Design a protein around this motif. Sequence first.
Motif, PDB file in Angstrom:
ATOM      1  N   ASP D  45       0.804  -1.214   0.000  1.00 29.97           N
ATOM      2  CA  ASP D  45       0.000   0.000   0.000  1.00 29.97           C
ATOM      3  C   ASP D  45       0.839   1.267   0.000  1.00 29.97           C
ATOM      4  OD1 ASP D  45      -2.196   1.857   0.384  1.00 29.97           O
ATOM      5  OD2 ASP D  45      -1.532   1.953   2.469  1.00 29.97           O
ATOM      6  N   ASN D  46       1.832   1.355   0.872  1.00 29.94           N
ATOM      7  CA  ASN D  46       2.727   2.496   0.909  1.00 29.94           C
ATOM      8  C   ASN D  46       4.127   2.063   0.529  1.00 29.94           C
ATOM      9  OD1 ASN D  46       0.718   3.601   3.409  1.00 29.94           O
ATOM     10  ND2 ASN D  46       1.381   5.062   1.844  1.00 29.94           N
ATOM     11  N   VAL D  47       4.577   2.548  -0.618  1.00 29.65           N
ATOM     12  CA  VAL D  47       5.926   2.274  -1.084  1.00 29.65           C
ATOM     13  C   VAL D  47       6.585   3.646  -1.135  1.00 29.65           C
ATOM     14  CG1 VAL D  47       7.254   0.885  -2.745  1.00 29.65           C
ATOM     15  CG2 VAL D  47       4.800   0.554  -2.511  1.00 29.65           C
ATOM     16  N   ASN D  48       6.184   4.513  -0.208  1.00 29.73           N
ATOM     17  CA  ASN D  48       6.593   5.909  -0.218  1.00 29.73           C
ATOM     18  C   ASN D  48       8.091   6.061  -0.034  1.00 29.73           C
ATOM     19  OD1 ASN D  48       6.596   8.686  -0.161  1.00 29.73           O
ATOM     20  ND2 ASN D  48       5.748   8.836   1.906  1.00 29.73           N
TER      21      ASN D  48
END
Lengths: 23, 55, 191, 111, 23, 256, 155
Positions: D45-48
Amino acid sequence: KRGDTISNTQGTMDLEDLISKFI
Amino acid sequence: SRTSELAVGIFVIIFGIALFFLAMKVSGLVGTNLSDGYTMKAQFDNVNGLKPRAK
Amino acid sequence: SRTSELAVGIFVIIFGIALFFLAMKVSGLVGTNLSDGYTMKAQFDNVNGLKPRAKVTMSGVTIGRVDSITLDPVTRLATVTFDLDGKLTSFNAEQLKEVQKNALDELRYSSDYTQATPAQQKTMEQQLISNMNSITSIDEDAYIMVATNGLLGEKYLKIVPGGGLNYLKRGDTISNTQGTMDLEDLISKFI
Amino acid sequence: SRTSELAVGIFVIIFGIALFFLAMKVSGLVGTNLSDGYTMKAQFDNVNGLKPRAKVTMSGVTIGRVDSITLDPVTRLATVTFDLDGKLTSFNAEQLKEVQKNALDELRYSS
Amino acid sequence: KRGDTISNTQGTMDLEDLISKFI
Amino acid sequence: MNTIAWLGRLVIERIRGIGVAALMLLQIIFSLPSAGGFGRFVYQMHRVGVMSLLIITVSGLFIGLVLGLQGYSILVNVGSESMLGTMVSLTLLRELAPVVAALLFAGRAGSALTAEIGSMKQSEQLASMEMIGVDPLKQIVSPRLWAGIVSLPMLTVIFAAIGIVGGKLVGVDFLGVDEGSFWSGMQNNVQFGHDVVNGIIKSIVFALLCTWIAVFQGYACDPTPEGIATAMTRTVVYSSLCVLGFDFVLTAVMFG
Amino acid sequence: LLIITVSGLFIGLVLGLQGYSILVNVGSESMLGTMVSLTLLRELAPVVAALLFAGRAGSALTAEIGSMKQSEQLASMEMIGVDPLKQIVSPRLWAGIVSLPMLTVIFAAIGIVGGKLVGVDFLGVDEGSFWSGMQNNVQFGHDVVNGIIKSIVFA
């Protein structure tokens, strides 16, 4: 108006009161 | 070569002036001018390291 | 043949600036490196420290920029103008066939298809023809917010999907926004 | 003539050393590569803020990298493609039979 | 097996999320 | 009007020439050199490169001693003395070792290609060569140009190698920095194929425009030994305008 | 003069371009104005100003006197009777001393004003924190004056 003195304000807190409020 | 000389000058002069202008502008005065700048006041107790010409 | 050297001396010096502007594509200052980009807008209440040419992400994939940040003092809200790179936020032949059959079966289910007009032949093509005209990816209750890039980064728009059922075209405005987070009120409201 | 055969032959001596310095004492491609390395994938979901060629770890040991980070608009997610190692992640034949009949010990686990 | 997909994933957490971690 | 038209004519003539130097440049490389070319080619390396070697070590040793000296003292105040090895490497490799290597090379050998050919113009030692019959574009230009292309990427690596190893000497021997965090700071952040290889591709086109101008501006100059110095600056001026003018396109195509 | 403006414009555009992007990650974009000033003023504007000056005019003092040596221009001057140490050396040396601190200030002035152009016009940095970052950390008598005393013995 263009020239007034905005009455209601509040100053900033320094980090030193943050220290005392922390403990 | 009247034509030649004139043409050469034209471009050269234009460019130079424009450039210098923009350059001197991107610094100090020159351009730096708001619009409808009035003035308000406020009074605090502890500014704490606030500077002139801040945001 | 004295003009030939002169002619090549023009032919090089107009070519050198042409490649010099060719580097001005991918450098990113002037021009956009976006294949058929499209503009969208949103309205915030706190855009603290959000520069132009910012980042727009979906879950970590940078899919846009930020062009201009405007105010309107009659309502005292912020208004952000941004374009998204779309060939990867926009669907194509597989997904357009996928989403058209998705919402017409799910959103227009027996709760919705069997509560409708008399002829269920024209309106079935209406749900599909209202979607081909440049639908993007972003559902009806997806929200956009402002992140902070780690711990001491710089602010950037984070688009988060909410799953949803209906999408929005190229030109709309996201209706679920929130401003930045700030340590000013939070330490006061924690201590 | 004879000095020139020396004073440029000694120049290609020094340039080879200073390329060896950059390759084998500075940059990542100094041998960073495991044996039969296979690839897997996962969804997030978050590959920030995650660049490709990152590290992968299991207990803090560098077992592999991240190859490609793609999005999929089919389901609004991000799917990471990465290659692990093949030796540190697969059991050897001795370790295989150590757990295989132990999986048979797990299979025939009483009930 | 090789080439499978690992389940049970959770992404990164940052300053915009640690507020949601406490309250 | 007068002076203006004068300057106009000036610019026109200048552009016309420039073009010429292009017409010279094809005529040097589009011919196969004969026997005896490699023997002068080695001596030009002996002349250009090997003589240039003693300079760039000292200015290589210098800049690393400075760049790791001053940024750290502001950087140490937060949490970072381990990123010292990254900032020294990634500014030398992708930014300065292309640029500052040429401006010392345009200094030494960017002149000695002109004045050695400004030599043979004043005493007609060019004109005698044509009269006996050679062609100096094959004889005294092509072994000069081919050494100038080769020897600069052969130096700017040499430059940055002592450039990084210089900054190690201030760090671990005087500032007491950890050796392991020093190097492994670099190893994680400096890839080979994107930085050191693309630090070379900058240094080739920084070598061609620096050395082709310094050959041409010594060949087509009038033999007056006053204007041999005004021709000397136009080597340095047109090099330094273009070795800096083509960093900004090369930085943008690689990254950004 | 025409050279050191362009290389003056360049180095500020680079030095404020790359250190900030690593520095912005913690808390500091306001110390951008300090690091550009204090490395140009006390470190590079003495050094890199001379290596461009030794390039151009460090040659044209030699080859103009390597002019008068090959055609016996020098020897004829003594023979007619002047002394070139008074005639062609002393007005050359006294210009060389004067003109370099007259340039390296000019250099670093566009050097700092160059880095402003990348900051406020492209990176969107605050103008007030930019300059007042400098005014607190860059004294006059210890940096700009002692950037001159370096540039005299470098000249």
